[PDB]
């Protein structure tokens, strides 16, 4: 379509000449003004998926760090994504590290960043999410679309559990799921359990029925996911895997950015974590490991170097039930969701899968 094509041209221009974070904020602004294209197509009923009772109309969403402050949830979802993870948010606002703090490498389709958890803080973002939830009631294209919220600690926190607790008390009512982003097995167990308790306490301390308590999509309490970084050793992964089973966690997001990459020349003297195509193989391997160490009792959300339908099926066959995009949107533009959904549908057919669910963990 011409709407997608025109923006993809503008994107490639922007990619060549303009600073990354400036580009990002610009396009976010365009989304806020609601002048980005829509994908109004019906998603294949065979590519639908779920994390327990949380149902996704298709297997592609947008990862955390893209719309940190939830300023244009509508427009991003309407590009064809089934869900978005806003945040990571913190209890108080943070400016993050010094700019410029994000850099791309087009030929390797990789990104490096050291943002330092810049965000408007839980109060403001909660206000933004509420406004979205009200629009969602009115907007036909937002029905059954999921919004998760990634929460983290402040830069100089007094207590991590209390930081996450503050966020949950503020924004939990409006979230379909919560992503814990922070890592010793002992500390993690405490963190995970406190989060579950505080979510359960929202149900308790309210006199309203669920239909009027959970102002979200599921009309139930938010699930609890945890997001893991790829830079762990095997003993660390096994220990974590146990805690996630002990705590009965609803899902795990595999994975965040890596520091193990150094063969990107333009990133030679650059500081931060890498994402994009170079993270793909590392991330896929991580999924297989945690899918095994866990005995497949914890659903997985895939993240890392997913650009194509082919890339998607790898993550799924490794154990993932859903996929998150970020770098793809930077390098492929507005068509990312429309394209990847089409490719995965073709692939699931040619490979002789009846539906997507059948392909999870096959390899
Ligand atoms: C600029 C930037 C900001 C990010 N911010 C967050 C964040 O706030 N919270 C989080 O969990 N992950 C964050 N991430 C990691 C992404 O959510 C994602 O896990 C990672 O980029 C791998 O996906 P990709 O290879 O498709 O880009 C960020 C990544 C980038 C590049
Ligand atoms: C040219 C261009 C663009 C870009 N993001 C865009 C992607 C496409 C898109 C679509 C809808 C909405 Br709403 C928002 C955005 C943000 N980025 N992001 C970075 C980085 C590495 F994060 F800095 N560089 C970029 N360069
Ligand atoms: C030279 C500028 C290139 C961008 C093209 C701008 C026109 C796009 C119009 C999209 C319509 C938005 N929508 C779907 C909400 O109507
Ligand atoms: O905000 C950031 O700097 C950030 C957070 C995160 O979780 N992952 C990442 O790569 N960057």
Curated annotation (Swiss-Prot):
Pathway where this protein functions: Pyrimidine metabolism; UMP biosynthesis via de novo pathway; orotate from (S)-dihydroorotate (quinone route): step 1/1
Membrane topology category: Single-pass membrane protein
Cofactor: FMN
Domain of life: Eukaryota
Location(s), subcellular: Mitochondrion inner membrane
GO MF terms, alphabetically ordered: dihydroorotate dehydrogenase (quinone) activity; dihydroorotate dehydrogenase activity
Residues involved in FMN binding: 64-68, 88, 181, 227, 275-276, 303-305, 326-327
Record-level GO BP terms: 'de novo' pyrimidine nucleobase biosynthetic process; 'de novo' UMP biosynthetic process; pyrimidine ribonucleotide biosynthetic process
Cofactor note: Binds 1 FMN per subunit.
Cellular compartments per GO CC: mitochondrial inner membrane
Enzyme class: oxidoreductase
UniProt-annotated binding residues for substrate: 68, 113-117, 181, 256-257
EC number: 1.3.5.2
Record keywords, A-Z: Flavoprotein, FMN, Membrane, Mitochondrion, Mitochondrion inner membrane, Oxidoreductase, Pyrimidine biosynthesis, Transit peptide, Transmembrane, Transmembrane helix
Reactions performed catalytically: (S)-dihydroorotate + a quinone = orotate + a quinol
Subunit comment: Monomer.
Entry function: Catalyzes the conversion of dihydroorotate to orotate with quinone as electron acceptor.
Family: Belongs to the dihydroorotate dehydrogenase family. Type 2 subfamily.
Protein name according to UniProt: Dihydroorotate dehydrogenase (quinone), mitochondrial
Organism encoding this protein: Plasmodium falciparum (isolate 3D7)
Lineage, broadest ranks: Eukaryota, Sar, Alveolata, Apicomplexa, Aconoidasida
Range covered out of full length: 162 to 565 of 569
């Amino acid at each position: 379509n011409p709407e997608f094509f025109l923006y993809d041209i503008f994107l490639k221009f922007c990619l060549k000449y303009i600073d990354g974070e400036i580009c990002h904020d610009l396009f976010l602004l365009l989304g806020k003004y609601n002048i980005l294209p829509y994908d109004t197509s019906n998603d294949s009923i065979y590519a639908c998926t779920n994390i327990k009772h949380l149902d996704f109309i298709n297997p592609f969403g947008v990862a955390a760090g893209f719309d940190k402050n939830g300023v244009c949830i509508d427009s991003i979802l309407k590009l064809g994504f089934s869900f978005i993870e806003i945040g990571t948010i913190t209890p108080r606002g943070q400016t993050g590290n010094a700019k410029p703090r994000i850099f791309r490498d087009v030929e390797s389709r990789s990104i490096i960043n050291s943002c330092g958890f810049n965000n408007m803080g839980c109060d403001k973002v909660t206000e933004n999410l509420i406004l979205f939830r009200k629009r969602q009631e009115e907007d036909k294209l937002l029905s059954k679309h999921i919004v998760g919220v990634s929460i983290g600690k402040n830069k100089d926190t007094v207590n991590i559990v209390d930081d996450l607790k503050y966020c949950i008390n503020k924004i939990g009512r409006y979230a379909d799921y919560i992503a814990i982003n922070v890592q010793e097995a002992g500390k993690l167990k405490n963190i995970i359990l406190s989060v579950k308790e505080e979510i359960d306490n929202l149900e308790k301390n309210n006199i309203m029925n669920d239909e009027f308590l959970w102002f979200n999509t599921t009309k139930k309490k938010p699930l609890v996911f945890v997001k893991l970084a790829p830079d762990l050793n095997q003993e660390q992964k096994k220990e974590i895997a146990d805690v996630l089973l002990e705590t009965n966690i609803d899902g795990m997001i595999i994975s965040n950015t890596t520091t193990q990459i150094n063969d990107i020349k333009s990133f030679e003297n650059k500081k931060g974590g890498v994402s994009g195509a170079k993270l793909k193989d590392i991330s896929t391997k991580f999924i297989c490991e945690m899918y095994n160490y866990t005995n497949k009792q914890i659903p997985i959300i895939a993240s890392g170097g997913i650009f194509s339908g082919l890339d998607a099926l790898e993550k799924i066959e490794a154990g993932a039930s859903v996929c998150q995009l970020y770098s793809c949107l930077v390098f492929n533009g507005m068509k990312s969701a429309v394209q990847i959904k089409r490719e995965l549908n073709h692939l699931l057919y040619q490979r002789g899968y009846y539906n997507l669910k059948e392909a999870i963990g096959r390899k």
